Design an enzyme around this catalytic site. Structure first.
Site, PDB file in Angstrom:
ATOM      1  N   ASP A  34       0.695  -5.064  12.538  1.00  0.00           N
ATOM      2  CA  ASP A  34       0.581  -5.303  11.103  1.00  0.00           C
ATOM      3  C   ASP A  34      -0.531  -4.436  10.508  1.00  0.00           C
ATOM      4  O   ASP A  34      -1.719  -4.770  10.609  1.00  0.00           O
ATOM      5  CB  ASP A  34       0.269  -6.782  10.870  1.00  0.00           C
ATOM      6  CG  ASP A  34       0.160  -7.129   9.413  1.00  0.00           C
ATOM      7  OD1 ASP A  34       0.547  -6.285   8.587  1.00  0.00           O
ATOM      8  OD2 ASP A  34      -0.317  -8.240   9.096  1.00  0.00           O
ATOM      9  N   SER A  42       0.992   6.805  -4.488  1.00  0.00           N
ATOM     10  CA  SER A  42       2.219   7.565  -4.606  1.00  0.00           C
ATOM     11  C   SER A  42       2.262   8.302  -5.940  1.00  0.00           C
ATOM     12  O   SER A  42       1.750   7.834  -6.959  1.00  0.00           O
ATOM     13  CB  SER A  42       3.421   6.632  -4.478  1.00  0.00           C
ATOM     14  OG  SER A  42       4.639   7.306  -4.711  1.00  0.00           O
TER      15      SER A  42
END
Length: 330
Positions: free
Chosen positions: A35, A199
């Site tokens: 994770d 992004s």
């Protein structure tokens, strides 16, 4: 040194991925959920409340010649999906794909929430976010990656998750045969303890790319792609019959639909998520309504590039002094 381990979807929807990890001496192999959005290595154990264990493989420290209780230490974590676990702490030898760390904090669960009990395939979590998020008290402990770092040939790990198929976690090297083209690297902020990056925009299907900054985290422990409501609405508006359902808890669409791809930007590069990766199947058994793999992050407080996004790429988690993230197509 290096390590290389295969990671395998737990079910037919790629809800999560499990990777075998050797703990203790002689080795006890547990299948852990790696994770990158948390920083605790915790396991079902001989100390876990018996009624809360249902099919998981447990770590038994009393059977390990290298286990030692970290006296007085406790841990307690809650995750974004509302699940939680807590317990005490051992140090022991932990190996992943041939890479061994001695003195790793192995957090032994005394209590786990129902979602963990009900998932027989996950024996615990191995956190790969920054150690500043680790929940051990009074003294925070380091992640497996943080401990391994100085021994590694290069201070990196890579996630190469499969679509309905196994993939690979590598430590200490970049497998140049595992991706096509080049890797594009982008800056990371560690301010919140995550592999947080920005992004450069998105496209829906064959649409033009919209240049817009989207801050979010690279999180292998989250199934879906969670993005701002504007972005997500623009995506599902292109799917006939799609709608947001408050009763179901997100966007749904007719299972007969052909989903458009979704492109996200990494600097001047682009990663294309195929439409099929966005189909998470019937909302309930036998339904002709399907659940979307791109959902709104509104109310989470952060955008999350979960498995839906990450499995479309070869992803480099660069833990150098100034950390970065790399993305390549594959």
């Amino acid at each position: 040194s290096t390590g290389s381990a295969t990671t395998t979807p737990i079910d037919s929807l790629d809800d999560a991925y499990i990777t075998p990890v050797q703990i203790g001496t002689p080795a006890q192999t547990l299948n852990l959920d790696f994770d990158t959005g948390s920083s605790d290595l915790w396991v079902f154990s001989s100390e876990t409340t018996a009624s809360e264990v249902d099919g998981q493989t447990i770590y038994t420290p009393s059977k390990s010649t290298t286990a030692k209780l970290l006296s007085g230490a406790t841990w307690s974590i809650s995750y974004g999906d509302g699940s939680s676990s807590s317990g005490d702490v051992y140090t022991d030898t932990v190996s992943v794909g041939g890479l061994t760390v001695t003195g790793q904090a192995v957090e032994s669960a005394k209590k786990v929430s129902s979602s963990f009990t009900e998932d027989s395939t996950i024996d615990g979590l191995l956190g790969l976010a920054f150690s500043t998020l680790n929940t051990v008290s009074p003294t925070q402990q380091k992640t497996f990656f943080d401990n391994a770092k100085a021994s590694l040939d290069s201070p990196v790990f890579t996630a190469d998750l499969g679509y309905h198929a196994p993939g690979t976690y590598n430590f200490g090297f970049i497998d140049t045969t595992a991706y096509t083209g080049s890797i594009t690297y982008t800056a990371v902020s560690t301010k919140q303890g995550f592999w947080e990056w920005t992004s450069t925009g998105y496209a829906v299907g064959s649409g033009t790319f919209k240049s817009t900054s989207i801050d979010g985290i690279a999180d292998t422990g989250t199934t879906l792609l969670y993005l701002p409501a504007t972005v997500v609405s623009a995506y599902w508006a292109q799917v006939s019959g799609a709608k947001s359902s408050s009763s179901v808890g997100g966007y749904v669409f007719p299972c007969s639909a052909t989903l458009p791809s979704f492109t996200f930007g990494v600097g001047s590069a682009r990663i294309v998520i195929p439409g099929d990766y966005i189909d998470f199947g019937p909302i309930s058994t036998g339904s002709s309504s399907c659940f979307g793999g791109i959902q709104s992050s509104a109310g989470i407080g952060i955008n999350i590039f979960g498995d839906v996004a990450l499995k479309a790429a070869f992803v480099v988690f660069n833990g150098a002094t100034t950390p970065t993230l790399g993305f390549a197509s594959k």
